[PDB]
Swiss-Prot record, chain A:
Acts as a component of the MCM2-7 complex (MCM complex) which is the putative replicative helicase essential for 'once per cell cycle' DNA replication initiation and elongation in eukaryotic cells. The active ATPase sites in the MCM2-7 ring are formed through the interaction surfaces of two neighboring subunits such that a critical structure of a conserved arginine finger motif is provided in trans relative to the ATP-binding site of the Walker A box of the adjacent subunit. The six ATPase active sites, however, are likely to contribute differentially to the complex helicase activity. Component of the MCM2-7 complex. The complex forms a toroidal hexameric ring with the proposed subunit order MCM2-MCM6-MCM4-MCM7-MCM3-MCM5; loaded onto DNA, forms a head-head double hexamer. Interacts with MCM10. It comes from Saccharomyces cerevisiae (strain ATCC 204508 / S288c) (Baker's yeast). Transmembrane segments: none annotated. It is found in: Nucleus. The modification Phosphoserine is found at S205. Belongs to the MCM family. The chain holds residues 103 to 463 of 1017 of the full protein. This is DNA replication licensing factor MCM6. Present with 13400 molecules/cell in log phase SD medium. Early fractionation of eukaryotic MCM proteins yielded a variety of dimeric, trimeric and tetrameric complexes with unclear biological significance. Specifically a MCM467 subcomplex is shown to have in vitro helicase activity which is inhibited by the MCM2 subunit. The MCM2-7 hexamer is the proposed physiological active complex.
From Swiss-Prot, chain B:
Present with 10300 molecules/cell in log phase SD medium. The lineage of its organism: Eukaryota, Fungi, Dikarya, Ascomycota, Saccharomycotina. This is Minichromosome maintenance protein 5. Acts as a component of the MCM2-7 complex (MCM complex) which is the putative replicative helicase essential for 'once per cell cycle' DNA replication initiation and elongation in eukaryotic cells. The active ATPase sites in the MCM2-7 ring are formed through the interaction surfaces of two neighboring subunits such that a critical structure of a conserved arginine finger motif is provided in trans relative to the ATP-binding site of the Walker A box of the adjacent subunit. The gene is MCM5. The chain holds residues 24 to 339 of 775 of the full protein. It is found in: Nucleus. It comes from Saccharomyces cerevisiae (strain ATCC 204508 / S288c) (Baker's yeast). Belongs to the MCM family.
Curated annotation (Swiss-Prot), chain C:
Belongs to the MCM family. The gene is MCM2. Component of the MCM2-7 complex. The complex forms a toroidal hexameric ring with the proposed subunit order MCM2-MCM6-MCM4-MCM7-MCM3-MCM5; loaded onto DNA, forms a head-head double hexamer. It comes from the Eukaryota. Acts as a component of the MCM2-7 complex (MCM complex) which is the putative replicative helicase essential for 'once per cell cycle' DNA replication initiation and elongation in eukaryotic cells. The active ATPase sites in the MCM2-7 ring are formed through the interaction surfaces of two neighboring subunits such that a critical structure of a conserved arginine finger motif is provided in trans relative to the ATP-binding site of the Walker A box of the adjacent subunit. The chain holds residues 201 to 460 of 868 of the full protein. This is DNA replication licensing factor MCM2. A zinc finger (C4-type) spans 141-167. Present with 1690 molecules/cell in log phase SD medium. Early fractionation of eukaryotic MCM proteins yielded a variety of dimeric, trimeric and tetrameric complexes with unclear biological significance. Specifically a MCM467 subcomplex is shown to have in vitro helicase activity which is inhibited by the MCM2 subunit. The MCM2-7 hexamer is the proposed physiological active complex. Changing E192K: In allele MCM2-1. It is found in: Nucleus.
Amino acid sequence: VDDVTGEKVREAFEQFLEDFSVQSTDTGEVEKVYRAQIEFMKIYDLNTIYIDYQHLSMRENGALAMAISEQYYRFLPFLQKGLRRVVRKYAPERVFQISFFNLPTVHRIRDIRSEKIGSLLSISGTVTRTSEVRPELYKASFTCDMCRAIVDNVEQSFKYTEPTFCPNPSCENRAFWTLNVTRSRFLDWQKVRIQENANEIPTGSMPRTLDVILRGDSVERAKPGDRCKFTGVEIVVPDVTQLGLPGVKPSSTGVRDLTYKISFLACHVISIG
Amino acid sequence: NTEIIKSFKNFILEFRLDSQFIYRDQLRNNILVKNYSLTVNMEHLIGYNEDIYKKLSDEPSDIIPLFETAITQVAKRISINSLPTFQLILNSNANQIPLRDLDSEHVSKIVRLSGIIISTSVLSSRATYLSIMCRNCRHTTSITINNFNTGNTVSLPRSCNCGPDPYIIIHESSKFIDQQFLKLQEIPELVPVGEMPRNLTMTCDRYLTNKVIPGTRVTIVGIYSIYNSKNSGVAIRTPYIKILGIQSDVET
Amino acid sequence: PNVSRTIARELKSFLLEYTDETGRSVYGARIRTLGEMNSESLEVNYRHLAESKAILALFLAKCPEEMLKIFDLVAMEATELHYPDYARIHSEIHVRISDFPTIYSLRELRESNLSSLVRVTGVVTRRTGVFPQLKYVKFNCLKCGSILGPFFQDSNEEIRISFCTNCKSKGPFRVNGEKTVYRNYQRVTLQEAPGTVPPGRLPRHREVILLADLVDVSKPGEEVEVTGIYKNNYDGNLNAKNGFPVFATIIEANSIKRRE
């Protein structure tokens, strides 16, 4: 089902960058620029790409980008596997991040609504109160009671938990959340608070904010107080601290209520303005 | 534990300078006034025997509560009902350790030093001998604590099964003592040119309370010990000096 | 590994047989300055070792947490041919690796500089008091005896070494105050120097652990140059943040230089 159409967006994207999306010849951009973008990262090894959004939508006439604009969150397992089938036919300690840019529209803070969860969009704002750079886990090696410390798979999510199946000892799913730093691959991120631009808003009534996560190789590119555009994803984060203004928050029948709020994720930041 | 009493019980009875012997005349004149203590000069231990002071200098926390029961077996050779546990107060003069250089090596060692006292506290109560009864079994017992190492080193047991800690302290038959909790600042003539003057906190036992006013120059002989309350780090303890014998000057 | 015995005999010749500038081997005339100050610290330059053997210069930047133990264990038996009665004065020497220019000011610390020797300058902001640390976890098991052998929890880790099947079954263990070797401890933070700031940005903090010799070497307001290592401290790392598995990073110091 989703495995089927997940390979279709995989094989189309794998067939996309193997072909060229640039027409003007004899003045640059000749013969599959994305193959030429690979070899420059083969010399330098910074593990990223910077591909256009319009250039994806020019070939199939938006037959593919409308899914990538809508169901963007589900396809990053399938876009990462599709890129890794390409470079192993090209290039011989590796991780890869897929950055987009050149979007048609710029949205604002007041137009943020929950019909666009897992989609792609841009936003402009003012950067305030940056923080420090810290590692995040993203892959664990949690051992067990027996000497088999084999743990390179499950529970890389946003919960800091360890796995349940494939038991090393003869026991069941024992205690969890162990991170043995001998083999675990951390990336770095920081947290900033974006604020709406001054010369758009009406009469001054404390304009609303967000908190944005900058993952990967985008760190310390946000200056304290300059305007920027960003990438599309809009996650929601489980939190505990929201209390005092109650609604109908559904319970979990270990009892725990669920409180949600909005947080923004990025992959490419551009400092226009 | 065994027979180190008799190696000290002969020290009180038989120590003797030229004509008049001291520790059977200091033990008798401190009972008629009802004073209940003793003052050992620490040079007279090592002149009489070196093997005794070898044990006392190595592991002092387990042997001074053995000498306190070696006195109260001698005061029943003089008085013949209520004779409590005696207290041992000692003083000497080897070499002052300044307050700035107290390393991690001097844990549980006899250390003397000097300084100025800043503040005191209000008195309190510590228990020595208490009586316990269980709530369901009602099996009475008696725990006698004599050692002092501040929070908890000796506590209630777990069974005489019955529940988690079924024991109650009975307040109608016990004995209690005092504690004082001073503070001590180093002398400003060992000047901290780029530092502030540090400080330590001591404890005092039953017969050294209310002896010193804030603002004096003292010399203090004690055990540099450690305690682990959380009242800022991982596996971090805190230092304090269990005073046994404050040799102040003339108060002036 | 078990290749360490090949390492032990072959850096020992660079404590005795490394000479320079017409005799006077600088690490034969260095152990004589131990003892007469009695200080358990060997100074070792990095340029004086990298020019001879380029193999071990790589094995300092790769994993110095297991490399420096072997570099300390044979460092005892270099002094023992000079001072044979040195088992009883601290019984231990740790080492003092000199300059290795990795990080420029403060802010180049990514994943790619993890668990490696980093050299960094800064300014001391504030510092705590001096405390003892355990360094020797000694149990209080009720089934076994209360000596029980020396076990090591000497990190920022606080190891969950449970006592199971000690004498006949799992005896309940605590800690006592008996016969263990404590050592000093003092946390001092450090921020970026005001001369080499980029325009506009605030300076950044970092926590530095000192250990057992280098306490009371700082004073608040000094241009200090730390040559520590860089690890991934657990034990309360963002306790209210479990949706973001974000770890705390503390530099454990290995040397301290003043302003130059």
